[PDB]
């Protein structure tokens, strides 16, 4: 499968899967979640534990606006 880009108005956000599979061996961080996780994602989740928050907790990954968002 291909990587996906989230079309944030302020700038595209790339999500590179390979880096995540390598750095996050605990796959159940994102996979086998109960239903609702597709409908649930949004800015609040992204800037929280959906993206940014995990980067902060794991001490690696982009945490600045311009590191995630890029036109």
Write out the residues near ligand HEC by the rule CB under 6 A: 1, 3-4, 6, 8-10, 13-17, 19-21, 23-25, 27, 29-31, 41-43, 46-47, 50-52, 54-55, 58, 60-65, 67-69
Q: What is the DSSP string of 4-56?
A: EEE--TTS-EEE-HHHHHHH---GGGTSS--TTHHHH-SHHHHHTTTTHHHHH
Report, in Å, the least distance between residue 64 CB and ligand HEC.
6
Nearer to ligand DXC, 39 or 64 (CB): 39
């Amino acid at each position: 499968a291909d990587d996906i880009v989230l079309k944030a108005k302020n700038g595209d956000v790339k999500f590179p899967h390979k880096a995540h599979q390598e750095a996050v061996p605990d796959c159940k961080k994102c996979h086998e979640k109960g239903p609702g996780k597709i409908e649930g994602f949004g800015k609040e989740m992204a800037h929280g534990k959906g993206c940014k928050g995990c980067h902060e907790e794991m001490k690696k990954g982009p945490t600045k606006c311009g590191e995630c968002h890029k036109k």
